Design an enzyme around this catalytic site. Sequence first.
Site, PDB file in Angstrom:
ATOM      1  CB  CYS A 105      44.124  35.379  52.869  1.00 24.15           C
ATOM      2  SG  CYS A 105      45.124  34.741  51.521  1.00 24.15           S
ATOM      3  CG  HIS A 153      38.524  34.779  51.482  1.00 27.19           C
ATOM      4  ND1 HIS A 153      39.533  35.585  51.963  1.00 27.19           N
ATOM      5  CD2 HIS A 153      39.129  33.790  50.770  1.00 27.19           C
ATOM      6  CE1 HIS A 153      40.696  35.102  51.547  1.00 27.19           C
ATOM      7  NE2 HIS A 153      40.471  34.022  50.821  1.00 27.19           N
ATOM      8  CD  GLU A 156      33.578  33.419  50.908  1.00 31.09           C
ATOM      9  OE1 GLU A 156      34.387  33.636  50.003  1.00 31.09           O
ATOM     10  OE2 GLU A 156      33.423  34.159  51.859  1.00 31.09           O
ATOM     11  CE  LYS A 216      40.307  39.269  49.705  1.00 30.75           C
ATOM     12  NZ  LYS A 216      39.272  39.236  50.783  1.00 30.75           N
ATOM     13  CG  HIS A 227      43.716  38.608  47.911  1.00 26.15           C
ATOM     14  ND1 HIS A 227      43.745  38.937  49.242  1.00 26.15           N
ATOM     15  CD2 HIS A 227      43.779  37.249  47.860  1.00 26.15           C
ATOM     16  CE1 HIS A 227      43.840  37.839  49.970  1.00 26.15           C
ATOM     17  NE2 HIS A 227      43.839  36.799  49.154  1.00 26.15           N
ATOM     18  CG  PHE A 270      47.303  30.492  50.282  1.00 25.18           C
ATOM     19  CD1 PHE A 270      46.001  30.894  50.007  1.00 25.18           C
ATOM     20  CD2 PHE A 270      48.222  30.463  49.244  1.00 25.18           C
ATOM     21  CE1 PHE A 270      45.616  31.260  48.718  1.00 25.18           C
ATOM     22  CE2 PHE A 270      47.838  30.811  47.947  1.00 25.18           C
ATOM     23  CZ  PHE A 270      46.522  31.206  47.690  1.00 25.18           C
TER      24      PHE A 270
HETATM   25 MG   LIG Z   1      35.724  39.697  53.985  1.00 21.26          MG
END
Ligand SMILES: [Mg+2]
Lengths: 408, 408
Positions: A163, A302, A313, A331, A336, A395
């Site tokens: 990611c 994220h 986060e 997202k 994603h 990951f």
């Molecule tokens: Mg970002």
Amino acid sequence: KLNRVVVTGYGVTSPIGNTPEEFWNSLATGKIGIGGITKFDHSDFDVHNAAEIQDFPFDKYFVKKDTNRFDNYSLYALYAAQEAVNHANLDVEALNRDRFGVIVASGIGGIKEIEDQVLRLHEKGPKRVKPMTLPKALPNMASGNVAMRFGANGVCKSINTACSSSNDAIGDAFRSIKFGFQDVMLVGGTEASITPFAIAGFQALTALSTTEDPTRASIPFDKDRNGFVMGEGSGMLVLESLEHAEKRGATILAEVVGYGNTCDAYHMTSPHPEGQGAIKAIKLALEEAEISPEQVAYVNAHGTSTPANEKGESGAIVAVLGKEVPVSSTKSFTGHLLGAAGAVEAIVTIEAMRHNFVPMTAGTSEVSDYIEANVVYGQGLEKEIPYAISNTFGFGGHNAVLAFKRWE
Amino acid sequence: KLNRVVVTGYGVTSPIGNTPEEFWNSLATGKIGIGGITKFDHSDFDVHNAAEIQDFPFDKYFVKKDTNRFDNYSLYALYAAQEAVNHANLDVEALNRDRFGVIVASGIGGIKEIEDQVLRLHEKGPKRVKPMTLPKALPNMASGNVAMRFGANGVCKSINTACSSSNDAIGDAFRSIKFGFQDVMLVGGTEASITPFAIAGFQALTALSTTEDPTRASIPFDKDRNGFVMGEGSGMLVLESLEHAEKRGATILAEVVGYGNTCDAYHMTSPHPEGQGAIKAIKLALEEAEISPEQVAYVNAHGTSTPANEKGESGAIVAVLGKEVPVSSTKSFTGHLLGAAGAVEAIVTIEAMRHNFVPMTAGTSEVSDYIEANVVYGQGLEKEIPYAISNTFGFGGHNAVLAFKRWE
Ligand SMILES: [Mg+2]
Ligand SMILES: [Mg+2]
């Protein structure tokens, strides 16, 4: 000795738009791209939504043969890269081609091709595997295809941090120009893994939302989040040294000032529960950029919409930046994009700075009670954004943070 | 301001040895690792040879349950990494863990897992895809597994430039320490793609030798060369700033001084006919190292045994280095380790500098009439090697060259 690094153009295909104008319009107005899956039969699956590109402008640059020479993963990068070149008014012909490079990140590469040829192998035997399977499928080939299209004879690679792939790609190109190895770089990432195998794979891990309502599946920071929604596409940026950009008269859209990458070294897919690694990655970006936490006016999270991700986060944003800095996750709009996430999100962040507007987190209606970050939802926010960061945390423990400066 | 970068240890599993002693001894007595394929039934294939690791020391560090978290591509990196840490007498415990990083290159990742799980998805449906599929298969995961093993909280990534992936990984870590971002890096490559699908894939491309005689299949530079032989395994190195090495009293094995990477931007499946991109990559390595073409005492070639590759590669070595410098390809021993090639070949090169010895190119008996490079075959050569380089040129146009300096 050291170079400043500037963004002079970008391009994109995504579930919310295939041009700069359409992309920003979706973000400013709140048009999401999550809907029912149409790319394959999903009746036996538990997941029924994804963020698809349902209007890919194939005919703009490609002909009918190209659907067979290239896997979609390469097609998206090539489109986005041509769009970026156009947007930058970059004349490939007039460059020192030895100082002109390409980085195209990808998590999984041409997985559709792999899956299809594996099946064809078992059923018809090895003389029947198509000759260009590996040239189309291998995760490095998109970067090579982009290099061929534009005669880039400088650096050419791909990077894989799941990611974080695109964030690290841009950081790498950033560092390459900053330290004088290249003057121009086409950099970003691409992914086309809305396929039976890739979906089944993340489903078996429990990482995908099974929510039926497409307006409620990708809900970063929300109380009721239950996994991510897979998207697809590519984003590509043209970076130049300031010197090189100014010596041809480019319109400068923004500047890259900081990059931090760390590793949780904690667990294979589960992120650090208090975001310890993320914390260090944000600090490293701020330090390179030589700014303070207070100067960060926006955070593009994220924010995958997973229970564990937003806990840590939010925790990490709060510990470094405090509880006032605006945070949103797009997202909620794009899905994603995996290895393409960072590239597309860098564009979001650059556009936000240029238009004085923090896009909202869509779909999210109530945040978890332990989450202390100023998550923006319901409607975006008008404000000045002199500096911003974009987070990704893949990951395998990969943390990557990019810090950008508004161009004035 | 700039740090020197030094090699303090290294580890390896390969078709010719799982320790630096076995591996070298192989190079010195002309024992090759090419033999019949045993990993799968190859009766319907046209290719019947490969360089397999048939004595993997699985019990040294693993137990049966670990095949559930790790594909062989990860297992090989984890072994090689522990061996390199042991070889360097590195106490992971005493390091600044934030200045300790990991880079593990791979061209294909855990392709065996992907292949098997794709088939099972088709036979039995998505409820049956294993939860650990992606964590085991995605090409970045090996780098994350290595980081977890050793508590490396600094830089962690994977790089993919096909056949150059390991060269670029080591070049990258080199630049990372040289410019002060890290003090210690575990870096190399791994591959485990001796599988039905990957073999069929390269067979359909026509890149694999179909020669029956294992003894004659991988014959770099030879007039009768007809494709490469796939190998498997991993090479890992410990790099440190000279300063950090000296403060803990480490034994320095060698030094990395130069790195050049370019792109042919010519064709996806064949190198430039005159090696124009390779030429520039070699020069860039020499320039960074600040040495002259005359100071290169050995070339560890890419030398895949493909008709195309050695024409342009010999052309390129001649045009920059002359016709005198000794050149050999160890792919004649190890096979083509793809993404692991560069890592293992860095070890070969480093060892050659420490034994005062150029390993031969095995199998090769007569070179093509147009090839002008001093290709060492029949037997190795005794000589002083104060500096050397190692080439890789991958599918997709990726050129990478590493320049090393002997330690005294
Ligand atoms: Mg970002
Ligand atoms: Mg080599």
